[PDB]
């Protein structure tokens, strides 16, 4: 049931992802060193991680079939609002349920609840973020469904500030239909049961997580002393 165009879209997104996600995590040595002792001792390190991660999400977004056809302004709005959501999604790849931490190669680059706490966040975000990681992980998505979900997340018509929502909605739909059809043909039962409905629900959880993250980000970014520890990109995208 998978058309030629849809098998093409999946080939594009898989490649786009592989070029923007290094599973060896070699670049992490460039980030400011993580400090585990110390209020906000992990902020400089994770700030750089996110800033790096924003760049990679942009690189992935540009390769989403149809994304280029949008105006630069709509491109900006979609990325600016989806960025944290897509980073939370793509982070699932390093998240292990063996201890509820993001394991990126080494112990120094293994991050858990307390590390995020020392980044300036409360449990009001961290618990549901882990809950999300656990719930997403238990879906055991095919990498094909993983990359489709991130693209569908990026191209959401309902983002505040979008102009040509019609075009955005036509890009996303073509992606939804590619995902739905893929689940039917390539994902065998029972793991395919309600699979699409459960994936869309994750986009709902991400909206809530985004809303909560922004709230806490503004509180942290309010003190110029903390705002200093961030990067110019993170400031530009997450707001000033």
């Amino acid at each position: 049931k998978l058309s030629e165009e849809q098998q093409h879209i999946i080939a594009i997104l898989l490649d786009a992802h592989h070029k923007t996600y290094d599973p060896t995590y070699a670049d992490f040595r460039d980030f400011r060193p993580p400090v585990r002792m110390s209020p906000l001792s992990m902020l400089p390190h994770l700030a750089d991680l996110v800033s790096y991660s924003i760049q990679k999400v942009i690189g992935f977004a540009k390769m989403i079939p149809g994304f280029r056809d949008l105006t630069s302004d709509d491109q900006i709005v979609l990325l600016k609002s989806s960025a944290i959501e897509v980073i939370m999604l793509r982070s699932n790849q390093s998240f292990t349920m063996d201890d509820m931490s993001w394991d990126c190669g080494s112990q120094d680059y293994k991050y858990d609840v307390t590390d995020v706490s020392k980044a300036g966040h409360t449990l009001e975000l961290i618990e549901p973020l882990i809950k999300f990681q656990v719930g997403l992980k238990k879906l055991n998505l095919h990498e094909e469904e993983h990359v489709l979900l991130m693209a569908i997340c990026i191209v959401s018509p309902d983002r505040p500030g979008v102009q040509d929502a019609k075009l955005v909605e036509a890009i996303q739909d073509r992606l939804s239909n590619t995902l739905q059809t893929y689940i039917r043909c390539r994902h065998p039962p029972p793991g395919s049961h309600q699979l699409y409905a459960k994936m869309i629900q994750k986009l709902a959880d991400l909206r809530s997580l985004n809303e909560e993250h922004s709230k806490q980000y503004r509180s942290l970014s309010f003190q110029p002393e903390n705002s200093m520890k961030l990067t110019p990109l993170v400031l530009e995208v997450f707001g000033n």
Binding site: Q55, I58, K62, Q75, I76, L79, L233, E236
Partner: peptide
């Protein structure tokens, strides 16, 4: 608007 760097990364 006001996004120099994000605009540049989008080529």
């Amino acid at each position: 608007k006001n996004h120099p760097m994000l605009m540049n990364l989008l080529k």
